[PDB]
Amino acid sequence: KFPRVKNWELGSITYDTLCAQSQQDGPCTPRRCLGSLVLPPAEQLLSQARDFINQYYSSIKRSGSQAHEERLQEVEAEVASTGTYHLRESELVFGAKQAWRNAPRCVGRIQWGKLQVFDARDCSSAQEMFTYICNHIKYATNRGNLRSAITVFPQRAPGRGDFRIWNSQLVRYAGYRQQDGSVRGDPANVEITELCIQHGWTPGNGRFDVLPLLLQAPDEAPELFVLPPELVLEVPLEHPTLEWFAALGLRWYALPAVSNMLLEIGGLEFSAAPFSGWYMSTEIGTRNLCDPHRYNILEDVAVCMDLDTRTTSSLWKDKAAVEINLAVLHSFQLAKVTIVDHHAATVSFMKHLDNEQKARGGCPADWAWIVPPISGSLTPVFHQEMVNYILSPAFRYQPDPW
Amino acid sequence: GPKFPRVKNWELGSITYDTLCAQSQQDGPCTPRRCLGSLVLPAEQLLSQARDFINQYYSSIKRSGSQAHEERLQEVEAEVASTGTYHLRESELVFGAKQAWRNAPRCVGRIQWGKLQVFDARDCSSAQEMFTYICNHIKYATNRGNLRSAITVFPQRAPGRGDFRIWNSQLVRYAGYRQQDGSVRGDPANVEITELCIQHGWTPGNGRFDVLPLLLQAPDEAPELFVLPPELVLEVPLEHPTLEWFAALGLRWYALPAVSNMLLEIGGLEFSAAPFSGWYMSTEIGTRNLCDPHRYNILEDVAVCMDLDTRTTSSLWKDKAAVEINLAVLHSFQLAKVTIVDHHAATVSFMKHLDNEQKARGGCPADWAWIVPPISGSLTPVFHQEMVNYILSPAFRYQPDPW
Numbered sequence: 002k003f004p005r006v007k008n009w010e011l012g013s014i015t016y017d018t019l020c021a022q023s024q025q026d027g028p029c030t031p032r033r034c035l036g037s038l039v040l041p042p043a044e045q046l047l048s049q050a051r052d053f054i055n056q057y058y059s060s061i062k063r064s065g066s067q068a069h070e071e072r073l074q075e076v077e078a079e080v081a082s083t084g085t086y087h088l089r090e091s092e093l094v095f096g097a098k099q100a101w102r103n104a105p106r107c108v109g110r111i112q113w114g115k116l117q118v119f120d121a122r123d124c125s126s127a128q129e130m131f132t133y134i135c136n137h138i139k140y141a142t143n144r145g146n147l148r149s150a151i152t153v154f155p156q157r158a159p160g161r162g163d164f165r166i167w168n169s170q171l172v173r174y175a176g177y178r179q180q181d182g183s184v185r186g187d188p189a190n191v192e193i194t195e196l197c198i199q200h201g202w203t204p205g206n207g208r209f210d211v212l213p214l215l216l217q218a219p220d221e222a223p224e225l226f227v228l229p230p231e232l233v234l235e236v237p238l239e240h241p242t243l244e245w246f247a248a249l250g251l252r253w254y255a256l257p258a259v260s261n262m263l264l265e266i267g268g269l270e271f272s273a274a275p276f277s278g279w280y281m282s283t284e285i286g287t288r289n290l291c292d293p294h295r296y297n298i299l300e301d302v303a304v305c306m307d308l309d310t311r312t313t314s315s316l317w318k319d320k321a322a323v324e325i326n327l328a329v330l331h332s333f334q335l336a337k338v339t340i341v342d343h344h345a346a347t348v349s350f351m352k353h354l355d356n357e358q359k360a361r362g363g364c365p366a367d368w369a370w371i372v373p374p375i376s377g378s379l380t381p382v383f384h385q386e387m388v389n390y391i392l393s394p395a396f397r398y399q400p401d402p403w
Numbered sequence: 404g405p406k407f408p409r410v411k412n413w414e415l416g417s418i419t420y421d422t423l424c425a426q427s428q429q430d431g432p433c434t435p436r437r438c439l440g441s442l443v444l445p446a447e448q449l450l451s452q453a454r455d456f457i458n459q460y461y462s463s464i465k466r467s468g469s470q471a472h473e474e475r476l477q478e479v480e481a482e483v484a485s486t487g488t489y490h491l492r493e494s495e496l497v498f499g500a501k502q503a504w505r506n507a508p509r510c511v512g513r514i515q516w517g518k519l520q521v522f523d524a525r526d527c528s529s530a531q532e533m534f535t536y537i538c539n540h541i542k543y544a545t546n547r548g549n550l551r552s553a554i555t556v557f558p559q560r561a562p563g564r565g566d567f568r569i570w571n572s573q574l575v576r577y578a579g580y581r582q583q584d585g586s587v588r589g590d591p592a593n594v595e596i597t598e599l600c601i602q603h604g605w606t607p608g609n610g611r612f613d614v615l616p617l618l619l620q621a622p623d624e625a626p627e628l629f630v631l632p633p634e635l636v637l638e639v640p641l642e643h644p645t646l647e648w649f650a651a652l653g654l655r656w657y658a659l660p661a662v663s664n665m666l667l668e669i670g671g672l673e674f675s676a677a678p679f680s681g682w683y684m685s686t687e688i689g690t691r692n693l694c695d696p697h698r699y700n701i702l703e704d705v706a707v708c709m710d711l712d713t714r715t716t717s718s719l720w721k722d723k724a725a726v727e728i729n730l731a732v733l734h735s736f737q738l739a740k741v742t743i744v745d746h747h748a749a750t751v752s753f754m755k756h757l758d759n760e761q762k763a764r765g766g767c768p769a770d771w772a773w774i775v776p777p778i779s780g781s782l783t784p785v786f787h788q789e790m791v792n793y794i795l796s797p798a799f800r801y802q803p804d805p806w
């Protein structure tokens with residue numbers, strides 16, 4: 002019995018047979034569904050490694066050659082003697098792309114084949130991590146013509162502490178907790194802001210202060226590195242027809258570079274492996290600026306637009322959000338920085354699902370994350386049933402290192 | 404942590420554990436390997452469903468273990484013993500109906516669950532009589548615009564003997580006429596039932612908003628056709644509070660949403676005809692019904708009137724039009740004095756319901772994809788609330804179409 006998956010807008014049906022290859026577990030059982038939840042030996046490492054080596058040789062269509070068997074022997078010999086093994090650059094490149102491809106929450110996977118992979122496994126200090134991170138940013142930003150990248154730092158080792166980037170993204174704005182309860186800047190970054198200050202960073206007092214990085218080499222206290230302002234491209238927000246909107250002094254950074262997830266390839270774990278593509282506009286316009294526990298600017302905007310704030314039924318919240326998202330798109334386009342709107346992103350994801358159906362017999366997708374945060378049923382993904390499951394290589398959550 | 408699903412609200416940072424889900428009788432469609440949450444779709448067996456139900460009834464009047472409780476159990480097993488089935492006391496039926504609603508994971512209006520008028524119609528014995536009960540239900544629920552939640556219950560499934568069925572999916576629905584050019588006039592969701600009404604002798608209209616007749620089936624009989632008298636069907640013409648031309652589009656919606664094709668299951672007993680109605684939340688009309696591409700699909704038309712750039716996704720024309728359509732729905736209903744609730748007020752009230760149910764029952768089964776509204780999602784507090792979905796009984800369940 003395999004999942005029948007229906008698109009309700011077109012009446013079409015597919016069957017997901019790729020989920021059979023799931024060896025990892027989602028949070029659900031048959032007695033209760035936990036899907037909307039945001040967070041969750043050597044022959045076993047070996048069996049994940051053989052499997053991953055199998056994927057890789059199949060990918061280059063050498064699925065049986067001398068090379069294939071000799072490579073499995075290498076991996077077997079290395080695990081038998083040392084309890085672990087190492088990946089070849091080109092396996093690593095293939096694993097990273099496959100991790101992205103398999104990421105159920107990513108709407109931008111049409112892009113999965115085009116990922117610049119920086120091998121930083123020859124990295125031995127916080128200082129080197131920083132240099133690599135700077136290269137990553139410079140490459141990925143590309144004066145606003147954004148390019149997808151990942152930089153992979155040295156894998157976890159049974160002996161020692163992990164390499165980690167303590168920040169959750171490479172670029173984030175500071176959130177300064179007030180004694181009077183409230184937050185100046187981004188409330189989601191209060192804890193990382195506090196951490197930075199105590200490892201000796203001099204704070205600013207703005208709404209949009211770019212945080213320094215805390216980089217940790219194994220079993221060493223993390224170190225502080227301030228990003229060179231010229232590396233951090235930012236887009237001031239204005240609105241195409243509302244002149245007052247610019248007066249709000251809103252801005253956002255160009256580069257979304259997630260730096261806290263663990264990358265897992267054939268049983269090996271890469272605890273520092275920051276990755277970036279480009280923003281979908283609703284991430285900034287709806288979530289970051291309008292979430293009540295984020296910058297929460299909807300009321301400010303509604304009042305400027307002169308809307309009736311006293312009642313939910315004037316749909317003031319909805320009207321303001323739409324203008325905010327429009328401002329984000331307009332500003333990014335004016336500054337010539339890559340962005341995709343939620344309509345174009347979901348249309349391309351549909352094409353991706355279809356590609357994936359033909360190529361693998363299904364696609365892991367997390368509906369609550371693929372459907373955008375405004376205008377859901379106005380996008381084709383709303384009407385598309387979706388099956389969520391964990392394939393490996395995978396990006397996974399890991400504990401905060403402090 | 405305790406050994407139960409942990410549930411987080413990401414706006415407020417708060418945690419709860421669902422203990423209620425451990426009372427779940429029915430498997431959902433998920434396994435450890437794969438999540439199917441986004442998907443839209445006897446002897447001792449009866450006795451134990453019955454027993455469990457009667458226990459629920461006695462708890463809710465706080466007489467668990469009492470002699471009246473043990474006598475009812477005995478009465479129910481004896482009745483099953485001799486007939487294969489049993490019957491509910493009136494007050495059990497009322498409790499089971501409210502509890503089915505309360506249990507419904509997809510319903511965001513459940514803060515209202517305790518206030519349901521239960522019309523007992525288990526004496527009903529003909530299609531004509533279904534019609535009278537249905538008309539009575541509509542008059543009572545509609546209440547000239549001040550809507551009142553209600554359910555009418557017809558006789559339960561009975562061994563061998565045929566079912567009572569309402570063929571229509573709601574008591575009030577608009578016709579969908581399949582055109583020569585292959586397109587649809589009216590509501591494309593209603594094509595099959597439209598065509599069925601024609602097959603059974605209905606003389607079809609040709610409007611975009613033709614109210615369907617009812618096709619009602621008493622046991623072992625072909626369905627009979629009944630035309631609702633127009634004046635029982637309240638409708639709201641749509642206008643916009645500032646865009647004057649919107650009224651000129653001639654759009655309208657009916658006031659009463661009355662789902663009629665679901666099965667109400669109580670203590671193993673099956674009520675195959677049990678239509679229920681509340682009032683609308685505005686996004687069901689303004690977003691789904693009017694803007695779904697496979698429904699009325701009016702988004703482009705509205706956007707063109709609003710002079711928006713429809714050649715490019717990045718103008719947000721879809722988003723701007725959809726907002727105005729929802730504002731029109733809200734505004735028109737308020738002007739016509741017909742009950743309606745917006746998706747902000749609804750979700751707030753549903754957060755409050757979740758909190759009540761946390762204290763009362765230790766959880767609340769909720770289907771996130773259906774609870775979050777189809778526009779402005781993360782603008783509502785339910786978006787940031789994790790939810791656990793499972794089936795409790797009494798339940799409203801899907802059932803195959805009678806044909």
Ligand code: HEM
Pocket residue numbers: 097100101104106107108109110112116149150151259262276277278279280281284341346370396
């Ligand atoms: C190319 C442009 C891309 C776009 C437009 C995009 C879009 C998105 C969006 C909207 C999300 C949901 C994230 C959130 O709401 O916080 C997401 C999640 C994610 N994407 Fe992408 N993505 C892109 C590229 C990438 C790349 C290059 C990778 C890695 C190689 C990646 C891996 C992920 C992962 C692992 C998640 C889940 C993050 C989490 O669980 O918090 N994506 N993507």
Ligand code: HEM
Pocket residue numbers: 500504507509510511512513515519552553554679680681682683684687744749773799
């Ligand atoms: C009192 C006002 C009510 C409101 C605002 C309301 C709101 C809603 C909404 C928005 C849905 C989603 C339906 C869809 O997207 O098609 C729904 C589903 C549902 N509601 Fe309500 N509801 C109300 C009253 C009722 C009543 C009185 C009952 C039954 C006694 C009920 C039982 C249901 C059930 C069973 C569903 C699921 C239907 C399905 O799965 O297709 N609700 N509710």
Ligand SMILES: NC(=[NH2+])NCCC[C@H](N)C(=O)O
Pocket residue numbers: 170257258259276277278279280281284285288289
């Ligand atoms: N486009 C990506 N690679 N996104 C990953 C998540 C970024 C996150 N949504 C943010 O608002 O900053």
Ligand SMILES: NC(=[NH2+])NCCC[C@H](N)C(=O)O
Pocket residue numbers: 512660661662679680681682683684687688691692
């Ligand atoms: N409020 C209710 N009882 N809703 C049941 C669903 C009605 C359906 N969404 C409609 O728009 O016609």
Ligand SMILES: [Zn+2]
Pocket residue numbers: 029033034035036433437438439440
């Ligand atoms: Zn699930």
